[PDB]
Structure formats: structure tokens, C-alpha cells
Amino acid sequence: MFDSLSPQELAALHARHQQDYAALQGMKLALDLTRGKPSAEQLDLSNQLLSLPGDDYRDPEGTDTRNYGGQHGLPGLRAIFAELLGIAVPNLIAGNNSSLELMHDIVAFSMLYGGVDSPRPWIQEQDGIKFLCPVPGYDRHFAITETMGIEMIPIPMLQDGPDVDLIEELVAVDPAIKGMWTVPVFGNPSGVTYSWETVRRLVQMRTAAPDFRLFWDNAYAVHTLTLDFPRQVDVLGLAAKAGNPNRPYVFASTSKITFAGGGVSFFGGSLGNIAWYLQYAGKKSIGPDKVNQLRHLRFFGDADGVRLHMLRHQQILAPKFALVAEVLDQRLSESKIASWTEPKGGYFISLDVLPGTARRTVALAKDVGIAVTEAGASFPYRKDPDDKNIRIAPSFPSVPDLRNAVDGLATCALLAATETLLNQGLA
């Protein structure tokens, strides 16, 4: 940490940081690093969708997609994602424009009705319900459990998955633990992909709750930043082999493949779980939007069509991620106050600044017109116990804007560090 600088040298460095920050403030910036959404250039890749499906409104089975019926979604589109996810067509359904809505409804159904093999609806559990939450994690997962009054237990992330030793120890003895949130490939925002061994342990471990569920939110399933695709671990297959076929609920989406908010969602599970979901989903809706599923089927053609499309996204995104890392390295590496992820896929870089300074860094950035994700955002209840983590979303801005924004962020992180050491430390 500022290795071998004396207090006098640190005070001189702090003055340089203040001057960098004054200059930054003079530029009157209006930049934003918070939006985990595709750029306009990425969305342009899918503009053919805007004139699809055209005159032929029938799918390959002859179904008139313009009329009512069919809860499972179009088999032809499901076959594409069955190949990508390694889940058979009967074990996969296609929904409307939101995978979050599938996860949410599953939690709501679990509360009101219980899961397919629950002893009772979760709302009838007088001692409450808990979910395990690997951190840093996805704030919209946490929002679902928080709103339903489900207690969240944060779990440390390690190199090839969460802390599975700890998870096993907790779930074995606490029947209130009903679920775990995961993003098992390129996690938001850790960038961590769960190893085969991690997945095997999670589907085999003994749980005090007979109806424990892994919410396997494979949001980034094909979302590589390199020219290679990750191998999908067969979580449903491994779970069935362990005698826990109902344990995993698998989700996926085309929001960051085609149009964000105009895509198609997917839910995968055991046949029993598919039937359970559809029994209650059938009370909610006659069924999903088949015309939008058809447009996607026509656009993609097959699984290789999706893969090639992802490589086109990769060509736009990879330079943005490379840029963020390069700027952070060049500005922060020598000070040793920070560390950051170097993800091989997904939509985020996770930055840790000097512990005790993340909130301050965000406030400094806000005052020079750079929006940076709120401190604590990737934690349940927004509680980052070390006040160090900042999520960075590189996807949306132009390269020149991203460069300025991250360089500004670095200036703020450095100033927050020297300010705190000198003014609080050497008070």
C-alpha cells in the first residue's frame, strides 16, 4: 500500500490526487458505468428481428403462432437452447421477455403452494425461510428474496465456485435453508464459473430441507469474451444421478443475445418440476408469446447460429473489458490499493478499492459527473462488510467515454485512499 512512501511523500501524492480531481471536475463530465445492458451497436446485430417473422406465421409443426394455446413454448426454439444448455426439449420451456419473472414466480409459488415435493407451502413455516447467497452476487436475485421476507445468508466466493465446504455444513443442519441463488457461468459480478466438481458437490450434498433448491440462473451461458465457449455442466443430470432430480431450477434468457427486454426466457428442470411450474403458471396465463418465439427461431436458425451471433457480440465487448482492465492497471497497480476481476465472459468487472473507501469513491465520482454503482450493491441488504466493492459495467458506453469514465474512477479511488489515510489515519 503506497509501498515505502513516507508520510511527507504521501501528503505530496495526495496533493497530486486533488489536482487530478480538480481537473476532472473542470471537464464537466456526464458519464455512467452502472448500466449492465447491451450497447446500441450490439442491439444492431439483431435488427433483422424487427421485420420478422414476415408472412409465414406458422412454426415448423404448423402451429398458427398468432392464436392461443401451448404453455411450453415452440419446440423448435426450445431445441436450440436444449443443445446450448444440454437440457432435453421436454425439460425446457420458453416463456416471455424475462427470466427474472420465471425465478420470481417460482419463489412465489414455493411460498404459496410449496414446491413439487414440499412438506407444506413455505409461507406456513413458522420459523421462516433462508436462502444462501454467494457474494458478490446479483442484486435482482436478492430483491426477490428480500421482498418475500426470506432471510439471506451471504457466502464467500472462491476461485472455482462459492465456499462449498461452508455451504455443505450449513444446509446439513438448518431445515429453514430452502434455496441458494447462483449464476454458475461468468457470475454477476464475480465473473466466476462453477467447476464440475463444485456442481457435483452442490447436487449431492445432504440438506436438512427435503425440498432444497439450487436457483441455477445461467444468465451468461454463452456470453463469452473470448473465441471459446464454456462447457455447460450437466447440473440436472448430476442431480438425477445423486437421487435429487428436483433440486435444480435452470434459467436462461436472450435479453443479452437479441433485445434486452424484447427477448425470450427459458426454464429447465426435471419433468416433475416442469409440470409443477406449468400447473400454477396456467392459472396466471393461457401461455407465452409464440410470435416472438418464432421470430427468434427464424433469426437464430440453430445453436451454431446463436454461437456465431455471440462471437459478433464478443467482438464489440471484449475491447471494452480489455480497456477497463488496462486503465485500472496503469493507474492503480503501483499503489497496491485495489484489485479487480479479469472475467472471461459475462457483463461485469468487480473492483475492490481500499477497504473503508468504496462509498467515498462513489461519492467523489458522482460529484464529477461519473455514475458508479452504489457501494454494497452486489450484497444482500446492500451490506458490503468491507466497504470495498464497486461493480463496473463496461458494455454500454462508447470506447472514448469508457476510457474517460474509468480513468476518472481511478482518480477518485486514489484520492479516497490518500484522503482516508491522511485525514482519518493520520488525524
Q: Contact between 65 and a copy of itself (CB under 8 A)?
A: yes
Cα 95 to Cα 144: distance, rounded to the nearest angstrom: 19
Residue 121, preceding bond cis, omega within 30 degrees? no
Sign of the Cα torsion 145, 150, 156, 159 reads negative
Show binding-site residues: 68, 99-100, 138-140, 188, 220, 253-255, 391
Binding partner of residue 253 among Cl ion, ligand PLP, a copy of itself, none, CB cut-off 5 to 8 Å per kind: ligand PLP
Q: Tell me the three cell numbers of residue 338.
A: 485495489
Q: How many residues bind a copy of itself (CB under 8 A)?
A: 53
Q: Contact between 199 and ligand PLP (CB under 6 A)?
A: no
Binding partner of residue 108 among ligand PLP, a copy of itself, Cl ion, none, CB cut-off 5 to 8 Å per kind: a copy of itself
Which SS3 state, helix, strand or coil, does residue 84 take? Answer: helix
The angle, 0 to 180 degrees and rounded to 10, between the axes of the packed helices 7-26 and 399-420 is: 140
Query: Contact 120/359 with Cβ under 8 angstroms?
Result: no
Nearer to ligand PLP, 36 or 376 (CB): 36
β pairing state of 130-135 and 161-162? unpaired
Query: Contact 233/194 with Cβ under 8 angstroms?
Result: yes
What minimum distance in Å lies between the beta carbon of 190 and ligand PLP? 11
Nearer to a copy of itself, 196 or 280 (CB): 280
Q: Rounded to a whole number, what is the distance in angstroms from the first to the last CA of the chain?
A: 18
Strand ranges for 38-89 from DSSP E? none
Among 237, 262, 355, 369, binds a copy of itself (CB under 8 A): 262
Q: Contact between 343 and a copy of itself (CB under 8 A)?
A: no
β pairing state of 370-371 and 31-32? parallel
What minimum distance in Å lies between the beta carbon of 259 and ligand PLP? 10
Binding partner of residue 219 among ligand PLP, Cl ion, a copy of itself, none, CB cut-off 5 to 8 Å per kind: ligand PLP
Q: Contact between 28 and a copy of itself (CB under 8 A)?
A: no
Neighbours of 128 (CB within 10 A): 11
Nearer to ligand PLP, 103 or 413 (CB): 103
Task: Give bridge partners of residue 133 from the DSSP assignment.
Answer: 154
* Burial 389-412, CB ≥16 within 10 A → b, else e: bbbbbbbbbeeeebbbbbbbbbbb
What minimum distance in Å lies between the beta carbon of 57 and a copy of itself? 6
Q: Contact between 182 and ligand PLP (CB under 6 A)?
A: no
* Residues contributing to the site for a copy of itself (CB under 8 A): 35, 37-38, 40, 43, 46-47, 49-51, 53-55, 57, 64-69, 96-98, 100-101, 104-105, 108, 111-113, 123, 140, 143-144, 147-148, 255, 259-262, 280, 283-292
* Residues contributing to the site for Cl ion (CB under 5 A): 137-138, 141, 181
* Residues contributing to the site for ligand PLP (CB under 6 A): 36, 98-100, 138, 183, 188, 217, 219, 253, 255, 265, 286
